[PDB]
Amino acid sequence: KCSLTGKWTNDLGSNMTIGAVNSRGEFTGTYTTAVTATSNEIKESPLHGTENTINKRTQPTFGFTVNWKFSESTTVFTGQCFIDRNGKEVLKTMWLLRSSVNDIGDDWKATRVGINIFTRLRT
Amino acid sequence: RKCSLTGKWTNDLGSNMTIGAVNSRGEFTGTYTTAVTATSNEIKESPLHGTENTINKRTQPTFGFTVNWKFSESTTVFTGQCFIDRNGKEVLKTMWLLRSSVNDIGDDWKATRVGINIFTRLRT
Amino acid sequence: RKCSLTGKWTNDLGSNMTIGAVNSRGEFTGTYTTAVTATSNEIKESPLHGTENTINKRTQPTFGFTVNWKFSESTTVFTGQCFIDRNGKEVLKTMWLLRSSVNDIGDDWKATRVGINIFTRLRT
Amino acid sequence: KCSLTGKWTNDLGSNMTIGAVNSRGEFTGTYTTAVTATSNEIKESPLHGTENTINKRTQPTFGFTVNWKFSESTTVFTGQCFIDRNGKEVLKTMWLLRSSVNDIGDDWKATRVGINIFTRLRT
Ligand SMILES: O=C(O)CCCC[C@@H]1SC[C@@H]2NC(=O)N[C@@H]21
Ligand SMILES: O=C(O)CCCC[C@@H]1SC[C@@H]2NC(=O)N[C@@H]21
Ligand SMILES: O=C(O)CCCC[C@@H]1SC[C@@H]2NC(=O)N[C@@H]21
Ligand SMILES: O=C(O)CCCC[C@@H]1SC[C@@H]2NC(=O)N[C@@H]21
Ligand SMILES: *[C@@H]1O[C@H](CO)[C@@H](O)[C@H](O)[C@H]1NC(C)=O
Ligand SMILES: *[C@@H]1O[C@H](CO)[C@@H](O)[C@H](O)[C@H]1NC(C)=O
């Protein structure tokens, strides 16, 4: 039931747009982040993921990657699409954000972690 | 010099991956062979797809990828960086999140397991 | 103005904590009442002990604390910051790691679950 | 078997010293980190934790907090003490590091995550 294809929003204000998913579970899309950790003018980036098909679960598991266009940075999201009591969709995700570093000896700090909630937009 | 994602890699738990191209866009897919599971099902090669960052031609770009487990309801996401070590050997330093499937959203809080991984080239 | 850890807090899952002093050192202990479990055992108030940072008198210091689950083999660690919101209400923004017990070190990779939590004062 | 009381070292080079643990599972100690994320002269800080007693497990679960003396920063560790095949002790931990921020609206990036391995020192 829960479908990833469409236009979602975050508790941070981000805007993601996913296209349709396949047979292979794959989808594509674009992210418009509203916050950055990088001091660079934010720009609409592409996200590539995949959705789980293992059994027609009305509430699949998903993950996707964001290739930031404005940072040497990479973000990954994983989560599950849930069907509320309101009858409403809900991505409950969690993400890891890697920062680019110049030494294997500094990598240990290269990574942050958090959540995000996505919902849908009207119209 | 050149840290390409492309190639065959193994990893600290025994797991093994195989990654292909990398478009002019960093996009790339491959397969995954875990060596271990949180679940109870026989392992099956699973497909992977990711993107390599290229926003200031760096010789050790970051990357990320999803793994669509074939034998399971859940999914894992990996993010790291392609380091060129001192030995001159490439070394993927990585980290993931394994998202398990839960029946009830009020049970979400527990579906997320976190970990590391270090990949090293297989290829002789 | 003043974000003290001291007081009674509840949290987004229903869980509830009670924290006491805060020495001249930030050290402090209290109890914990989870509302939910990864395990199968009846819940029992568990003890907690932490430390509040005070290295440049900030009005919203960071903190951390461990929870020594009484009904279980495992442990959870919380770290966050004591925000003074705009409503003027304190708000603990937090995050944890729940370390489960495993029998075999080769099974370590899966013992770590990660999550959030937001605490809000109970006290009327 | 696995005992936390003593002097350990990391894969980063850090030095921690824990005292004895109680009956309540509690211990104390001091951390000497060898890397920082903060640009401040590093200084030996105090760590307060607790160890799990729930059944005499020769391989308990532990967690402790580090009140950094040189940063507005807090670190938390959790892990398990393991008894190797070599007969040797091994803390396999994982930590979360909170950075101090000035706005609830920037908190989302306030947190990094990683590992650490501790072993023992000789002498
Ligand atoms: O700092 C960078 O290099 C790019 C940051 C991208 C924004 C991150 S993605 C995780 C979190 N969720 C969002 O929507 N934005 C921040
Ligand atoms: O147990 C499942 O739900 C399928 C997971 C398959 C492997 C996970 S991905 C994180 C960790 N590292 C590996 O190489 N494999 C495990
Ligand atoms: O299931 C166990 O092993 C005991 C865990 C008790 C509660 C965990 S701590 C993280 C999460 N947030 C809560 O308030 N409780 C759970
Ligand atoms: O940057 C700060 O504010 C203090 C950093 C303390 C060092 C951290 S603790 C996690 C990781 N492990 C270590 O031993 N050091 C880094
Ligand atoms: C997303 O778009 C909505 C309206 O379509 C807007 O109000 C919000 O500010 C946008 N946030 C972005 C661009 O991430
Ligand atoms: C820890 O001490 C050892 C020797 O006791 C030393 O070689 C190492 O550099 C130290 N690291 C620190 C001070 O964190």
Side-chain angles (χ1 to χ4, degrees):
Chain A
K1 235 105 167 197
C2 229
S3 190
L4 275 208
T5 218
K7 288 173 55 208
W8 323 72
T9 276
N10 271 10
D11 53 311
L12 295 182
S14 295
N15 284 343
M16 115 219 186
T17 272
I18 329 236
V21 298
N22 279 163
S23 323
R24 300 233 338 168
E26 331 173 55
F27 45 86
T28 63
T30 82
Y31 207 90
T32 328
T33 190
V35 301
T36 46
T38 240
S39 47
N40 226 102
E41 103 135 342
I42 280 132
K43 76 185 277 212
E44 202 215 59
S45 334
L47 61 93
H48 186 82
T50 202
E51 188 208 86
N52 179 45
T53 30
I54 273 87
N55 318 175
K56 155 195 199 103
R57 301 278 23 238
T58 117
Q59 300 177 145
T61 69
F62 73 79
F64 55 86
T65 308
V66 180
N67 191 158
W68 286 134
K69 252 358 172 344
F70 60 100
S71 57
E72 335 207 286
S73 198
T74 338
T75 308
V76 306
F77 296 67
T78 186
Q80 201 175 28
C81 189
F82 290 93
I83 284 346
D84 222 15
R85 50 179 259 145
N86 287 344
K88 42 202 283 223
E89 264 142 328
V90 230
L91 274 33
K92 293 221 85 246
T93 53
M94 199 134 195
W95 46 265
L96 312 141
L97 165 79
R98 115 102 69 165
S99 263
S100 177
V101 305
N102 203 227
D103 221 79
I104 21 203
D106 277 323
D107 168 84
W108 79 254
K109 61 178 158 208
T111 316
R112 285 137 126 127
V113 64
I115 61 224
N116 268 131
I117 313 190
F118 312 55
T119 14
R120 298 208 113 133
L121 286 172
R122 50 178 297 120
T123 300
Chain B
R1 54 118 144 138
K2 175 83 150 166
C3 210
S4 58
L5 241 38
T6 302
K8 287 187 157 164
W9 318 80
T10 177
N11 104 16
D12 66 311
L13 305 162
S15 298
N16 287 333
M17 44 155 205
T18 100
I19 328 221
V22 154
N23 265 191
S24 316
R25 332 80 184 274
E27 256 156 39
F28 63 91
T29 49
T31 67
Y32 211 108
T33 355
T34 169
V36 304
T37 318
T39 209
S40 290
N41 221 83
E42 34 158 81
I43 294 65
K44 227 321 89 186
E45 237 173 343
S46 353
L48 81 94
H49 330 226
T51 42
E52 199 198 81
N53 209 292
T54 64
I55 290 62
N56 267 341
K57 180 49 184 199
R58 311 212 77 216
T59 30
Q60 329 169 96
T62 45
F63 63 82
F65 61 79
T66 313
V67 211
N68 202 19
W69 297 118
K70 273 340 163 139
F71 59 96
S72 120
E73 278 179 45
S74 94
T75 338
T76 291
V77 306
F78 284 82
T79 24
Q81 183 174 348
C82 199
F83 283 116
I84 282 357
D85 244 81
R86 39 178 264 156
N87 287 341
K89 289 242 294 213
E90 266 131 307
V91 182
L92 265 54
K93 294 207 113 166
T94 245
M95 166 161 234
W96 46 271
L97 276 178
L98 147 62
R99 179 32 139 88
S100 307
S101 214
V102 303
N103 287 347
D104 194 38
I105 123 153
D107 272 336
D108 175 284
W109 73 263
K110 89 246 300 225
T112 310
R113 282 194 277 253
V114 65
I116 235 257
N117 269 128
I118 306 179
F119 292 77
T120 243
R121 280 250 213 61
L122 249 166
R123 352 165 67 266
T124 320
Chain C
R1 54 118 144 138
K2 175 83 150 166
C3 210
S4 58
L5 241 38
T6 302
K8 287 187 157 164
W9 318 80
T10 177
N11 104 16
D12 66 311
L13 305 162
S15 298
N16 287 333
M17 44 155 205
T18 100
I19 328 221
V22 154
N23 265 191
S24 316
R25 332 80 184 274
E27 256 156 39
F28 63 91
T29 49
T31 67
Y32 211 108
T33 355
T34 169
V36 304
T37 318
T39 209
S40 290
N41 221 83
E42 34 158 81
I43 294 65
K44 227 321 89 186
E45 237 173 343
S46 353
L48 81 94
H49 330 226
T51 42
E52 199 198 81
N53 209 292
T54 64
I55 290 62
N56 267 341
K57 180 49 184 199
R58 311 212 77 216
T59 30
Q60 329 169 96
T62 45
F63 63 82
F65 61 79
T66 313
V67 211
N68 202 19
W69 297 118
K70 273 340 163 139
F71 59 96
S72 120
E73 278 179 45
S74 94
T75 338
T76 291
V77 306
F78 284 82
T79 24
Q81 183 174 348
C82 199
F83 283 116
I84 282 357
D85 244 81
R86 39 178 264 156
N87 287 341
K89 289 242 294 213
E90 266 131 307
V91 182
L92 265 54
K93 294 207 113 166
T94 245
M95 166 161 234
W96 46 271
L97 276 178
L98 147 62
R99 179 32 139 88
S100 307
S101 214
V102 303
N103 287 347
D104 194 38
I105 123 153
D107 272 336
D108 175 284
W109 73 263
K110 89 246 300 225
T112 310
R113 282 194 277 253
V114 65
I116 235 257
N117 269 128
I118 306 179
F119 292 77
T120 243
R121 280 250 213 61
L122 249 166
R123 352 165 67 266
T124 320
Chain D
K1 235 105 167 197
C2 229
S3 190
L4 275 208
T5 218
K7 288 173 55 208
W8 323 72
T9 276
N10 271 10
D11 53 311
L12 295 182
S14 295
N15 284 343
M16 115 219 186
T17 272
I18 329 236
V21 298
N22 279 163
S23 323
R24 300 233 338 168
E26 331 173 55
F27 45 86
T28 63
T30 82
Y31 207 90
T32 328
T33 190
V35 301
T36 46
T38 240
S39 47
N40 226 102
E41 103 135 342
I42 280 132
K43 76 185 277 212
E44 202 215 59
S45 334
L47 61 93
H48 186 82
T50 202
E51 188 208 86
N52 179 45
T53 30
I54 273 87
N55 318 175
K56 155 195 199 103
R57 301 278 23 238
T58 117
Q59 300 177 145
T61 69
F62 73 79
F64 55 86
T65 308
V66 180
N67 191 158
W68 286 134
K69 252 358 172 344
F70 60 100
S71 57
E72 335 207 286
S73 198
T74 338
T75 308
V76 306
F77 296 67
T78 186
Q80 201 175 28
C81 189
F82 290 93
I83 284 346
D84 222 15
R85 50 179 259 145
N86 287 344
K88 42 202 283 223
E89 264 142 328
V90 230
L91 274 33
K92 293 221 85 246
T93 53
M94 199 134 195
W95 46 265
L96 312 141
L97 165 79
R98 115 102 69 165
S99 263
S100 177
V101 305
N102 203 227
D103 221 79
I104 21 203
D106 277 323
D107 168 84
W108 79 254
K109 61 178 158 208
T111 316
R112 285 137 126 127
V113 64
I115 61 224
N116 268 131
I117 313 190
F118 312 55
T119 14
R120 298 208 113 133
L121 286 172
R122 50 178 297 120
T123 300

